[PDB]
Amino acid sequence: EVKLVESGGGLVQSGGSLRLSCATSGFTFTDYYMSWVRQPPGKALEWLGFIRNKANGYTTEYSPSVKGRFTISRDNSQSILYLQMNTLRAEDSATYYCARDHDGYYERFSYWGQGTLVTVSAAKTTPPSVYPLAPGSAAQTNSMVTLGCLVKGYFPEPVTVTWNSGSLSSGVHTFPAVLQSDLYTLSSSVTVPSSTWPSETVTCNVAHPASSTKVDKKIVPR
């Protein structure tokens, strides 16, 4: 199974350095070029550079934008790609993706990781407070009931939110986080049949990588 997982992302201060990693599987890492591409929130994709295969000496090329600041290497034994970032700045805050590259000559590829978010900032890492959103004691309408989860006051992004460990997918709207001062707040709504809640369990699962925190908040009536 071809899979690429980036990690190492998170919070780093200005002028600081950071090293991202990308674990690959499902193919011969050895003879494949590998690229790093980044994307600032709401912006276009930007190629950063690559590192060629052994058949080509495992050599590297970069874009003028990262000239003498970032470095690409690959631990061929570990079969893992890395990206050393230096003298970072606000403009470097973005999602970094690794991708299996080669050279048009070959026909195949098209593999990217889910990406890791790097936030360059001085603000303090803060875990989220997770609050259940259940209907007021009021008389709600519909054979359907909408529940919620308020994930408040964390930093930096991101947070991952799932319902019943991913089992509840259909009927989920997770709203983009909004920043206030140096803290993010987001919410997620899920709608389910009134005959299923509260007779069945409905739990909001929140993970906050930067602070290594996981919270499961069960939504209970009244």
């Binding site: 276009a44 026909e107 990217w112 407070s129």
Partner: protein, 219 residues
Amino acid sequence: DIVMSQSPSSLAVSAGEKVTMSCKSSQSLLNSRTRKNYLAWYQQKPGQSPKLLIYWASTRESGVPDRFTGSGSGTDFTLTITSVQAEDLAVYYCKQSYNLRTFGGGTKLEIKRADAAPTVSIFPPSSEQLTSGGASVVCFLNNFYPKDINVKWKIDGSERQNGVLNSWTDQDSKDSTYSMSSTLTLTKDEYERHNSYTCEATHKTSTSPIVKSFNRNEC
């Protein structure tokens, strides 16, 4: 530095309609020996990692629907979606790999649809948040269209705007609607000094706001 210029910046059609987008390179991407144009097209759906649809300018990747066609040779290329589907909502990027790699600025594809009123729901602060001395009232405006909407908060019948945060989701790949969240945050003492909390949504779909509310002491 091969520059990739994409046009237009954004497009919009109802489902089933056709669209094309252009990508122009500052240098020919045609390889003499291979006879292939090193130009690929990527589809990036909201919140997802990019996905390759077309390579060598016209070869569809395995599994990509036939509605996706690529054309052109040398410097001017075009990606055509013969019949836009709701799930096609995305930002599309072209990328040359003739010399190093470079991405275009992308083209955003939005879907047009029938106006739709939001389904509104309001939530009082949780007992858990009150213990922290805070109190956020949350209102969800789900599945509406167009994206353009207004939310007005009222406490004891008087409008309030300080302490409000609004967030909109990207367009829905299911039904092409939008959803949005509005949070009003107060201090618990603030919250307890009042009794009526209201969330009003005015959408083009009606001159009469969809009103949802609760009283702190309701039964």
